PDB file of C-alpha atoms in Angstrom:
ATOM      1  CA  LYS X   1     -12.461  18.495   9.936  1.00 39.34           C
ATOM      2  CA  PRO X   2     -12.287  17.711   6.184  1.00 39.16           C
ATOM      3  CA  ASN X   3     -15.300  17.618   3.836  1.00 39.28           C
ATOM      4  CA  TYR X   4     -14.464  14.899   1.299  1.00 42.08           C
ATOM      5  CA  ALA X   5     -17.257  14.583  -1.224  1.00 40.65           C
ATOM      6  CA  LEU X   6     -17.614  11.993  -3.989  1.00 43.85           C
ATOM      7  CA  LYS X   7     -16.489  13.394  -7.402  1.00 46.07           C
ATOM      8  CA  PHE X   8     -15.993  10.347  -9.685  1.00 41.55           C
ATOM      9  CA  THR X   9     -16.568   6.576  -9.741  1.00 42.15           C
ATOM     10  CA  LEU X  10     -14.150   4.588 -11.902  1.00 41.29           C
ATOM     11  CA  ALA X  11     -15.497   1.314 -13.378  1.00 39.29           C
ATOM     12  CA  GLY X  12     -13.452  -1.137 -15.406  1.00 37.48           C
ATOM     13  CA  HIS X  13     -11.885  -3.860 -13.346  1.00 37.77           C
ATOM     14  CA  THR X  14     -13.728  -7.219 -13.685  1.00 38.81           C
ATOM     15  CA  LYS X  15     -12.762  -8.615 -10.235  1.00 40.72           C
ATOM     16  CA  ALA X  16     -11.894  -7.221  -6.790  1.00 41.15           C
ATOM     17  CA  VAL X  17      -9.578  -4.204  -6.852  1.00 40.12           C
ATOM     18  CA  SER X  18      -6.433  -4.839  -4.725  1.00 37.09           C
ATOM     19  CA  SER X  19      -4.567  -1.482  -4.607  1.00 33.68           C
ATOM     20  CA  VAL X  20      -4.758   2.150  -5.766  1.00 33.32           C
ATOM     21  CA  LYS X  21      -1.780   4.529  -5.833  1.00 40.45           C
ATOM     22  CA  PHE X  22      -1.378   8.116  -7.077  1.00 44.21           C
ATOM     23  CA  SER X  23       1.703   8.920  -9.157  1.00 47.03           C
ATOM     24  CA  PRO X  24       4.142  11.148  -7.255  1.00 46.55           C
ATOM     25  CA  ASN X  25       3.729  13.837  -9.984  1.00 45.40           C
ATOM     26  CA  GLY X  26      -0.058  13.972  -9.239  1.00 48.54           C
ATOM     27  CA  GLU X  27      -1.173  13.214 -12.808  1.00 47.49           C
ATOM     28  CA  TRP X  28      -2.283   9.567 -12.561  1.00 48.22           C
ATOM     29  CA  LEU X  29      -3.942   6.887 -10.458  1.00 50.14           C
ATOM     30  CA  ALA X  30      -2.738   3.252 -10.921  1.00 47.46           C
ATOM     31  CA  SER X  31      -5.020   0.366  -9.841  1.00 44.00           C
ATOM     32  CA  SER X  32      -4.297  -3.371  -9.590  1.00 45.17           C
ATOM     33  CA  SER X  33      -6.882  -6.167  -9.438  1.00 46.57           C
ATOM     34  CA  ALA X  34      -7.528  -9.861  -9.049  1.00 44.83           C
ATOM     35  CA  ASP X  35      -8.459  -9.574 -12.790  1.00 46.85           C
ATOM     36  CA  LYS X  36      -4.646  -9.691 -13.495  1.00 49.24           C
ATOM     37  CA  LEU X  37      -4.659  -6.095 -14.855  1.00 49.16           C
ATOM     38  CA  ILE X  38      -3.213  -2.741 -13.938  1.00 46.04           C
ATOM     39  CA  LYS X  39      -5.288   0.286 -15.002  1.00 46.40           C
ATOM     40  CA  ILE X  40      -4.210   3.920 -15.276  1.00 44.10           C
ATOM     41  CA  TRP X  41      -6.705   6.734 -14.695  1.00 42.89           C
ATOM     42  CA  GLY X  42      -6.530  10.545 -14.680  1.00 44.45           C
ATOM     43  CA  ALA X  43      -6.051  11.657 -11.035  1.00 47.24           C
ATOM     44  CA  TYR X  44      -8.172  14.859 -11.415  1.00 46.87           C
ATOM     45  CA  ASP X  45     -11.033  13.800 -13.801  1.00 52.26           C
ATOM     46  CA  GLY X  46     -11.040   9.977 -13.172  1.00 51.58           C
ATOM     47  CA  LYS X  47     -10.802   9.485 -16.976  1.00 49.47           C
ATOM     48  CA  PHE X  48      -9.657   5.948 -17.982  1.00 48.69           C
ATOM     49  CA  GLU X  49      -6.213   6.104 -19.659  1.00 50.08           C
ATOM     50  CA  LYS X  50      -5.155   2.476 -20.397  1.00 52.15           C
ATOM     51  CA  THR X  51      -4.718  -1.128 -19.263  1.00 49.33           C
ATOM     52  CA  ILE X  52      -1.295  -2.741 -18.580  1.00 48.79           C
ATOM     53  CA  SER X  53      -1.461  -6.506 -19.059  1.00 51.00           C
ATOM     54  CA  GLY X  54       0.869  -9.472 -18.726  1.00 51.83           C
ATOM     55  CA  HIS X  55       0.551 -11.082 -15.287  1.00 54.37           C
ATOM     56  CA  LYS X  56      -0.783 -14.638 -15.466  1.00 56.69           C
ATOM     57  CA  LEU X  57      -2.748 -14.489 -12.138  1.00 58.51           C
ATOM     58  CA  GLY X  58      -4.241 -11.804  -9.901  1.00 57.57           C
ATOM     59  CA  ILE X  59      -2.200  -8.819  -8.711  1.00 59.56           C
ATOM     60  CA  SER X  60      -2.112  -7.865  -4.995  1.00 58.29           C
ATOM     61  CA  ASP X  61      -0.135  -4.591  -5.189  1.00 61.36           C
ATOM     62  CA  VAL X  62       1.283  -1.958  -7.593  1.00 60.02           C
ATOM     63  CA  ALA X  63       3.650   0.934  -6.760  1.00 60.98           C
ATOM     64  CA  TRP X  64       5.135   3.921  -8.604  1.00 61.14           C
ATOM     65  CA  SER X  65       8.768   4.901  -8.975  1.00 62.01           C
ATOM     66  CA  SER X  66       9.522   8.313  -7.447  1.00 63.24           C
ATOM     67  CA  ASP X  67       9.747   9.941 -10.964  1.00 65.05           C
ATOM     68  CA  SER X  68       6.313   8.533 -12.005  1.00 61.44           C
ATOM     69  CA  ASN X  69       7.962   6.735 -14.997  1.00 60.46           C
ATOM     70  CA  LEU X  70       7.717   3.105 -13.754  1.00 59.35           C
ATOM     71  CA  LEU X  71       5.347   0.787 -11.930  1.00 61.11           C
ATOM     72  CA  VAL X  72       6.158  -2.420 -10.091  1.00 63.54           C
ATOM     73  CA  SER X  73       3.401  -5.026  -9.535  1.00 65.65           C
ATOM     74  CA  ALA X  74       3.281  -8.127  -7.234  1.00 64.30           C
ATOM     75  CA  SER X  75       1.238 -11.166  -8.467  1.00 64.71           C
ATOM     76  CA  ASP X  76      -0.032 -14.612  -7.447  1.00 63.02           C
ATOM     77  CA  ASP X  77       1.934 -15.787 -10.550  1.00 63.70           C
ATOM     78  CA  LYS X  78       4.997 -15.556  -8.148  1.00 60.18           C
ATOM     79  CA  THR X  79       6.549 -12.685 -10.121  1.00 58.87           C
ATOM     80  CA  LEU X  80       6.920  -8.977  -9.913  1.00 58.88           C
ATOM     81  CA  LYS X  81       6.920  -6.965 -13.132  1.00 59.81           C
ATOM     82  CA  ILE X  82       8.573  -3.573 -13.761  1.00 59.93           C
ATOM     83  CA  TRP X  83       6.582  -1.527 -16.276  1.00 56.20           C
ATOM     84  CA  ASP X  84       7.416   1.569 -18.323  1.00 55.21           C
ATOM     85  CA  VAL X  85       4.081   3.422 -17.847  1.00 51.62           C
ATOM     86  CA  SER X  86       4.345   5.654 -20.986  1.00 55.30           C
ATOM     87  CA  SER X  87       4.967   2.709 -23.386  1.00 52.95           C
ATOM     88  CA  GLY X  88       3.182  -0.052 -21.374  1.00 52.36           C
ATOM     89  CA  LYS X  89       6.328  -2.217 -21.842  1.00 50.03           C
ATOM     90  CA  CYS X  90       7.230  -4.891 -19.272  1.00 52.66           C
ATOM     91  CA  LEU X  91      10.893  -3.951 -18.738  1.00 53.73           C
ATOM     92  CA  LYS X  92      11.684  -6.876 -16.396  1.00 53.95           C
ATOM     93  CA  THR X  93       9.982  -9.871 -14.783  1.00 56.33           C
ATOM     94  CA  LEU X  94      11.422 -10.526 -11.310  1.00 56.46           C
ATOM     95  CA  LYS X  95      11.507 -14.278 -10.645  1.00 56.21           C
ATOM     96  CA  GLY X  96      12.711 -15.859  -7.410  1.00 57.14           C
ATOM     97  CA  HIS X  97       9.882 -15.954  -4.843  1.00 56.89           C
ATOM     98  CA  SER X  98       8.628 -19.543  -4.298  1.00 61.51           C
ATOM     99  CA  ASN X  99       4.995 -18.448  -3.647  1.00 60.88           C
ATOM    100  CA  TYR X 100       2.530 -15.582  -4.290  1.00 60.72           C
ATOM    101  CA  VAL X 101       4.086 -12.067  -4.191  1.00 55.65           C
ATOM    102  CA  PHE X 102       1.832  -9.906  -1.999  1.00 56.58           C
ATOM    103  CA  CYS X 103       3.519  -6.504  -1.658  1.00 54.89           C
ATOM    104  CA  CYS X 104       6.100  -4.296  -3.334  1.00 51.28           C
ATOM    105  CA  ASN X 105       7.724  -0.852  -3.401  1.00 53.77           C
ATOM    106  CA  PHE X 106      10.621   1.055  -4.967  1.00 57.06           C
ATOM    107  CA  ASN X 107      13.243   2.709  -2.774  1.00 56.80           C
ATOM    108  CA  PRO X 108      13.406   6.519  -2.903  1.00 59.03           C
ATOM    109  CA  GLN X 109      16.103   6.430  -5.702  1.00 58.35           C
ATOM    110  CA  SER X 110      13.893   3.955  -7.521  1.00 56.36           C
ATOM    111  CA  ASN X 111      17.120   1.793  -8.180  1.00 57.35           C
ATOM    112  CA  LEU X 112      15.853  -1.056  -5.902  1.00 56.90           C
ATOM    113  CA  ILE X 113      12.575  -2.848  -5.406  1.00 57.56           C
ATOM    114  CA  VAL X 114      11.554  -4.597  -2.189  1.00 55.66           C
ATOM    115  CA  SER X 115       8.964  -7.429  -2.263  1.00 56.86           C
ATOM    116  CA  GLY X 116       7.216  -9.617   0.279  1.00 57.29           C
ATOM    117  CA  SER X 117       5.655 -13.029  -0.337  1.00 58.20           C
ATOM    118  CA  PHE X 118       3.490 -15.887   0.958  1.00 58.41           C
ATOM    119  CA  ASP X 119       6.936 -17.660   0.950  1.00 57.32           C
ATOM    120  CA  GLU X 120       7.652 -15.691   4.210  1.00 58.73           C
ATOM    121  CA  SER X 121      10.636 -13.843   2.669  1.00 56.63           C
ATOM    122  CA  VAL X 122      11.520 -10.286   1.754  1.00 58.49           C
ATOM    123  CA  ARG X 123      13.540  -9.876  -1.474  1.00 60.62           C
ATOM    124  CA  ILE X 124      15.538  -6.843  -2.655  1.00 61.39           C
ATOM    125  CA  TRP X 125      15.965  -6.496  -6.419  1.00 59.13           C
ATOM    126  CA  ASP X 126      18.072  -4.333  -8.765  1.00 62.33           C
ATOM    127  CA  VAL X 127      15.675  -2.258 -10.958  1.00 65.97           C
ATOM    128  CA  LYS X 128      17.998  -1.884 -13.974  1.00 66.42           C
ATOM    129  CA  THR X 129      19.110  -5.587 -14.204  1.00 65.12           C
ATOM    130  CA  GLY X 130      15.935  -7.185 -12.728  1.00 61.24           C
ATOM    131  CA  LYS X 131      18.150  -9.465 -10.567  1.00 61.85           C
ATOM    132  CA  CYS X 132      17.638 -10.347  -6.899  1.00 62.17           C
ATOM    133  CA  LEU X 133      20.405  -8.819  -4.661  1.00 62.12           C
ATOM    134  CA  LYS X 134      19.263 -10.344  -1.314  1.00 58.46           C
ATOM    135  CA  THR X 135      16.674 -12.736   0.138  1.00 58.90           C
ATOM    136  CA  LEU X 136      15.794 -12.044   3.827  1.00 55.42           C
ATOM    137  CA  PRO X 137      14.327 -14.979   5.792  1.00 55.29           C
ATOM    138  CA  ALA X 138      12.138 -12.304   7.358  1.00 54.50           C
ATOM    139  CA  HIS X 139       8.987 -13.918   8.819  1.00 56.73           C
ATOM    140  CA  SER X 140       7.213 -17.219   9.677  1.00 55.70           C
ATOM    141  CA  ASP X 141       3.941 -16.425   7.796  1.00 57.39           C
ATOM    142  CA  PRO X 142       3.060 -14.415   4.689  1.00 58.32           C
ATOM    143  CA  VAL X 143       4.572 -10.938   4.400  1.00 57.95           C
ATOM    144  CA  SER X 144       1.703  -8.408   4.095  1.00 61.81           C
ATOM    145  CA  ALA X 145       3.634  -5.146   3.433  1.00 64.21           C
ATOM    146  CA  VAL X 146       7.158  -3.865   2.701  1.00 63.34           C
ATOM    147  CA  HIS X 147       8.299  -0.210   2.583  1.00 62.81           C
ATOM    148  CA  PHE X 148      11.598   1.692   2.446  1.00 64.56           C
ATOM    149  CA  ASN X 149      12.266   4.619   4.800  1.00 63.95           C
ATOM    150  CA  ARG X 150      12.968   8.181   3.604  1.00 61.87           C
ATOM    151  CA  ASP X 151      16.650   7.581   2.533  1.00 63.42           C
ATOM    152  CA  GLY X 152      16.301   3.836   1.566  1.00 65.72           C
ATOM    153  CA  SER X 153      18.697   2.633   4.306  1.00 64.77           C
ATOM    154  CA  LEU X 154      15.902   0.666   6.110  1.00 63.88           C
ATOM    155  CA  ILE X 155      13.042  -1.608   5.109  1.00 61.49           C
ATOM    156  CA  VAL X 156       9.993  -2.259   7.272  1.00 64.89           C
ATOM    157  CA  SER X 157       8.062  -5.525   6.767  1.00 65.00           C
ATOM    158  CA  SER X 158       4.857  -6.797   8.336  1.00 65.21           C
ATOM    159  CA  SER X 159       3.513 -10.334   8.555  1.00 59.50           C
ATOM    160  CA  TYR X 160       0.601 -12.509   9.586  1.00 62.46           C
ATOM    161  CA  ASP X 161       3.156 -13.902  12.145  1.00 61.63           C
ATOM    162  CA  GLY X 162       2.251 -10.783  14.228  1.00 62.52           C
ATOM    163  CA  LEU X 163       5.540  -8.950  13.736  1.00 61.04           C
ATOM    164  CA  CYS X 164       6.839  -5.818  12.138  1.00 62.80           C
ATOM    165  CA  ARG X 165      10.589  -5.978  11.420  1.00 61.84           C
ATOM    166  CA  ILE X 166      13.054  -3.301  10.371  1.00 60.61           C
ATOM    167  CA  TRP X 167      15.942  -4.398   8.130  1.00 59.36           C
ATOM    168  CA  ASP X 168      19.238  -2.809   7.113  1.00 58.26           C
ATOM    169  CA  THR X 169      18.953  -2.558   3.302  1.00 58.30           C
ATOM    170  CA  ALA X 170      22.730  -3.016   2.772  1.00 60.36           C
ATOM    171  CA  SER X 171      23.458  -5.904   5.215  1.00 54.65           C
ATOM    172  CA  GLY X 172      20.038  -7.627   5.425  1.00 53.64           C
ATOM    173  CA  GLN X 173      20.412  -7.609   9.280  1.00 51.70           C
ATOM    174  CA  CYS X 174      17.218  -7.626  11.365  1.00 50.32           C
ATOM    175  CA  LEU X 175      17.589  -4.352  13.349  1.00 50.04           C
ATOM    176  CA  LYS X 176      14.263  -4.325  15.217  1.00 51.38           C
ATOM    177  CA  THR X 177      11.166  -6.422  15.897  1.00 50.11           C
ATOM    178  CA  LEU X 178       8.001  -4.554  16.992  1.00 51.27           C
ATOM    179  CA  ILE X 179       4.955  -6.180  18.620  1.00 46.90           C
ATOM    180  CA  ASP X 180       2.508  -4.877  21.241  1.00 47.42           C
ATOM    181  CA  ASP X 181       0.756  -6.676  24.146  1.00 45.89           C
ATOM    182  CA  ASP X 182      -1.207  -9.067  21.846  1.00 48.35           C
ATOM    183  CA  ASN X 183      -0.056 -10.989  18.689  1.00 47.64           C
ATOM    184  CA  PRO X 184      -2.716 -10.421  15.978  1.00 44.91           C
ATOM    185  CA  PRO X 185      -1.644 -10.738  12.329  1.00 46.58           C
ATOM    186  CA  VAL X 186      -0.079  -7.500  10.988  1.00 45.23           C
ATOM    187  CA  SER X 187      -1.819  -6.653   7.661  1.00 43.67           C
ATOM    188  CA  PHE X 188      -0.005  -3.452   6.696  1.00 47.45           C
ATOM    189  CA  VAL X 189       2.921  -1.225   7.637  1.00 45.37           C
ATOM    190  CA  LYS X 190       4.696   1.826   6.243  1.00 44.40           C
ATOM    191  CA  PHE X 191       7.062   4.571   7.384  1.00 40.60           C
ATOM    192  CA  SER X 192       5.600   8.055   8.046  1.00 40.53           C
ATOM    193  CA  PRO X 193       6.326  10.662   5.349  1.00 38.85           C
ATOM    194  CA  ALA X 194       9.334  12.170   7.217  1.00 38.17           C
ATOM    195  CA  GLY X 195      10.231   8.627   8.491  1.00 40.08           C
ATOM    196  CA  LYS X 196      10.088   9.285  12.339  1.00 40.02           C
ATOM    197  CA  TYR X 197       7.239   6.717  12.772  1.00 39.30           C
ATOM    198  CA  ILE X 198       5.724   3.547  11.317  1.00 38.84           C
ATOM    199  CA  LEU X 199       1.951   3.122  10.851  1.00 37.70           C
ATOM    200  CA  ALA X 200       0.807  -0.521  11.234  1.00 39.92           C
ATOM    201  CA  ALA X 201      -2.573  -2.222  10.846  1.00 42.01           C
ATOM    202  CA  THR X 202      -3.457  -5.391  12.781  1.00 42.33           C
ATOM    203  CA  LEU X 203      -6.462  -7.687  12.184  1.00 41.89           C
ATOM    204  CA  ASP X 204      -8.005  -6.683  15.494  1.00 44.30           C
ATOM    205  CA  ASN X 205      -9.610  -3.470  14.061  1.00 45.17           C
ATOM    206  CA  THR X 206      -6.586  -1.330  15.054  1.00 46.59           C
ATOM    207  CA  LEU X 207      -4.135   1.102  13.424  1.00 45.97           C
ATOM    208  CA  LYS X 208      -1.067   2.037  15.466  1.00 49.35           C
ATOM    209  CA  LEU X 209       1.577   4.750  15.128  1.00 48.83           C
ATOM    210  CA  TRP X 210       4.942   3.602  16.503  1.00 53.36           C
ATOM    211  CA  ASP X 211       8.144   5.458  17.257  1.00 55.17           C
ATOM    212  CA  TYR X 212      10.325   2.660  15.851  1.00 53.35           C
ATOM    213  CA  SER X 213      13.598   4.153  17.288  1.00 55.62           C
ATOM    214  CA  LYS X 214      12.077   4.056  20.869  1.00 55.45           C
ATOM    215  CA  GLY X 215      10.005   0.860  20.081  1.00 53.13           C
ATOM    216  CA  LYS X 216       6.863   2.514  21.564  1.00 53.06           C
ATOM    217  CA  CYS X 217       3.264   2.684  20.347  1.00 51.64           C
ATOM    218  CA  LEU X 218       2.398   6.427  20.521  1.00 55.05           C
ATOM    219  CA  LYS X 219      -1.155   6.483  19.059  1.00 56.33           C
ATOM    220  CA  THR X 220      -3.960   4.038  18.239  1.00 55.99           C
ATOM    221  CA  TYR X 221      -6.749   4.720  15.695  1.00 54.64           C
ATOM    222  CA  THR X 222      -9.935   2.687  16.196  1.00 54.51           C
ATOM    223  CA  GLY X 223     -13.582   2.685  15.151  1.00 51.33           C
ATOM    224  CA  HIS X 224     -13.347   0.859  11.793  1.00 51.57           C
ATOM    225  CA  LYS X 225     -13.626  -2.826  10.978  1.00 49.57           C
ATOM    226  CA  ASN X 226     -10.527  -4.784   9.955  1.00 48.63           C
ATOM    227  CA  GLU X 227     -10.341  -8.478  10.940  1.00 48.48           C
ATOM    228  CA  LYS X 228      -9.778 -10.211   7.555  1.00 48.45           C
ATOM    229  CA  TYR X 229      -8.226  -8.167   4.720  1.00 47.86           C
ATOM    230  CA  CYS X 230      -4.865  -6.433   4.108  1.00 50.12           C
ATOM    231  CA  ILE X 231      -6.224  -2.825   4.078  1.00 49.05           C
ATOM    232  CA  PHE X 232      -3.644  -0.109   3.324  1.00 50.48           C
ATOM    233  CA  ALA X 233      -3.646   3.027   5.436  1.00 49.40           C
ATOM    234  CA  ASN X 234      -2.359   6.492   4.525  1.00 48.14           C
ATOM    235  CA  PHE X 235      -1.028   9.749   5.975  1.00 45.33           C
ATOM    236  CA  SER X 236      -2.987  12.621   4.422  1.00 47.44           C
ATOM    237  CA  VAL X 237      -0.673  15.703   4.413  1.00 46.37           C
ATOM    238  CA  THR X 238      -2.075  18.182   1.778  1.00 46.92           C
ATOM    239  CA  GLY X 239      -4.613  19.856   4.139  1.00 45.74           C
ATOM    240  CA  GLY X 240      -5.309  18.706   7.678  1.00 45.83           C
ATOM    241  CA  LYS X 241      -3.006  15.966   9.053  1.00 46.03           C
ATOM    242  CA  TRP X 242      -5.181  12.813   8.848  1.00 43.60           C
ATOM    243  CA  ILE X 243      -4.912   9.011   8.906  1.00 43.61           C
ATOM    244  CA  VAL X 244      -7.037   7.416   6.109  1.00 44.15           C
ATOM    245  CA  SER X 245      -8.087   3.758   5.830  1.00 43.71           C
ATOM    246  CA  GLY X 246     -10.600   1.482   4.229  1.00 47.31           C
ATOM    247  CA  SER X 247     -12.855  -0.671   6.386  1.00 46.32           C
ATOM    248  CA  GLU X 248     -14.794  -3.975   6.219  1.00 42.58           C
ATOM    249  CA  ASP X 249     -18.075  -2.073   6.820  1.00 46.78           C
ATOM    250  CA  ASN X 250     -17.672  -0.581   3.303  1.00 44.84           C
ATOM    251  CA  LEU X 251     -16.625   2.913   4.558  1.00 47.29           C
ATOM    252  CA  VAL X 252     -13.474   5.067   4.268  1.00 48.37           C
ATOM    253  CA  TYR X 253     -12.442   6.299   7.745  1.00 47.70           C
ATOM    254  CA  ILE X 254     -10.505   9.558   8.355  1.00 45.96           C
ATOM    255  CA  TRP X 255      -8.960  10.295  11.750  1.00 49.22           C
ATOM    256  CA  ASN X 256      -7.175  13.306  13.168  1.00 49.35           C
ATOM    257  CA  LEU X 257      -3.504  12.109  13.389  1.00 49.02           C
ATOM    258  CA  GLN X 258      -2.821  14.042  16.648  1.00 48.15           C
ATOM    259  CA  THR X 259      -6.129  13.614  18.542  1.00 46.92           C
ATOM    260  CA  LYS X 260      -7.055  10.098  17.156  1.00 42.36           C
ATOM    261  CA  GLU X 261     -10.673  11.303  16.754  1.00 42.55           C
ATOM    262  CA  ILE X 262     -12.705  10.154  13.715  1.00 42.00           C
ATOM    263  CA  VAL X 263     -13.308  13.329  11.611  1.00 42.26           C
ATOM    264  CA  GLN X 264     -15.178  11.791   8.601  1.00 41.83           C
ATOM    265  CA  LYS X 265     -16.544   8.492   7.202  1.00 41.48           C
ATOM    266  CA  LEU X 266     -17.102   8.226   3.440  1.00 40.17           C
ATOM    267  CA  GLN X 267     -20.139   6.188   2.321  1.00 42.80           C
ATOM    268  CA  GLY X 268     -20.815   4.810  -1.188  1.00 41.26           C
ATOM    269  CA  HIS X 269     -18.933   1.539  -1.763  1.00 42.14           C
ATOM    270  CA  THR X 270     -21.003  -1.698  -1.705  1.00 39.78           C
ATOM    271  CA  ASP X 271     -18.177  -3.972  -0.497  1.00 39.68           C
ATOM    272  CA  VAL X 272     -15.079  -3.831   1.731  1.00 38.84           C
ATOM    273  CA  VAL X 273     -12.843  -0.809   1.021  1.00 38.07           C
ATOM    274  CA  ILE X 274      -9.492  -2.664   0.470  1.00 36.36           C
ATOM    275  CA  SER X 275      -7.291   0.317  -0.490  1.00 35.64           C
ATOM    276  CA  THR X 276      -7.084   4.087  -0.198  1.00 32.67           C
ATOM    277  CA  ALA X 277      -4.544   6.575  -1.524  1.00 31.24           C
ATOM    278  CA  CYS X 278      -3.996  10.320  -0.865  1.00 29.49           C
ATOM    279  CA  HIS X 279      -3.067  12.673  -3.751  1.00 27.03           C
ATOM    280  CA  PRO X 280       0.417  14.207  -3.305  1.00 23.90           C
ATOM    281  CA  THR X 281      -0.697  17.872  -3.766  1.00 22.89           C
ATOM    282  CA  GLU X 282      -4.529  18.182  -3.805  1.00 24.51           C
ATOM    283  CA  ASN X 283      -7.004  17.166  -1.115  1.00 24.78           C
ATOM    284  CA  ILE X 284      -8.104  14.072  -3.113  1.00 24.49           C
ATOM    285  CA  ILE X 285      -8.605  10.497  -1.813  1.00 26.00           C
ATOM    286  CA  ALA X 286      -8.941   7.388  -4.037  1.00 22.73           C
ATOM    287  CA  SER X 287     -10.781   4.370  -2.546  1.00 21.50           C
ATOM    288  CA  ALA X 288     -11.270   0.889  -4.010  1.00 21.05           C
ATOM    289  CA  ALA X 289     -13.468  -2.039  -3.141  1.00 20.98           C
ATOM    290  CA  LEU X 290     -13.684  -5.845  -3.294  1.00 21.84           C
ATOM    291  CA  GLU X 291     -15.510  -8.269  -5.679  1.00 22.29           C
ATOM    292  CA  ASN X 292     -19.144  -7.304  -4.956  1.00 23.16           C
ATOM    293  CA  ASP X 293     -18.356  -3.604  -5.906  1.00 23.91           C
ATOM    294  CA  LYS X 294     -15.275  -3.569  -8.274  1.00 22.46           C
ATOM    295  CA  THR X 295     -15.151   0.275  -8.394  1.00 19.46           C
ATOM    296  CA  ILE X 296     -12.642   2.986  -7.490  1.00 17.62           C
ATOM    297  CA  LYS X 297     -13.983   6.312  -6.121  1.00 23.21           C
ATOM    298  CA  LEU X 298     -12.330   9.777  -6.172  1.00 19.76           C
ATOM    299  CA  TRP X 299     -13.269  12.111  -3.295  1.00 21.46           C
ATOM    300  CA  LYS X 300     -12.254  15.790  -2.900  1.00 20.43           C
ATOM    301  CA  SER X 301     -12.233  18.115   0.137  1.00 21.13           C
ATOM    302  CA  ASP X 302     -12.072  21.896   0.689  1.00 23.22           C
TER     303      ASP X 302
END
């Protein structure tokens, strides 16, 4: 079992936090908020670095490029923005979604961005030109998450329509639809770090690990509360092999990936824990909470 202990609390956002992500190089934490801002923090000391501004409405998601040089953000202003983190410059504004942009990610080569929207589409954009390469008529309700697999040849999307879909990046073809024995909204999905599996959250208090090639649910993680919000979940890989998630009872939950047992709950937030992130090299978790709390917490384990 891990022994995550609170090390730092990061105050600065003026509304609900929406996402936290560690830079791949381990140096930084990026946060997005309903306050329309991105903040950068030191990953190891929690020290505030700077604010990246320009969205006109709240931000739902932010993601790093694989070389830690760029961020992409998804906003209710119906845009994504590509940011040079060192300069703070907005390199490109990606316009084309017809409603709120909810989710975003770079591909592994950080030459493409994928986005999902309340407009029920998935878009694929060229990083260097900022132009949209493809629009996928992916879902019949808002798209909650989008993620590329380990070589960028596939995208997984999740939706409030109750589906996860896997797309061919090059053709835009729908290769797979995954759904279990009930049809609750899907609030999050991502590929596993080696890409054998997907991890999906549904708004029935359930995380599931799927073998997407076989189309089978292999594991379920339960015990937390998740019926309303799009709560990210993580694979923790630096020490023990864990699943990490926020929860609507204001806790961070940590499960054993193999056994599905709860191994730790982290107490301290005063509102829903909307987002968690796992440091790429150190046993460090970042957690972030909604409007009644507005803080980020850094936790560290032996």
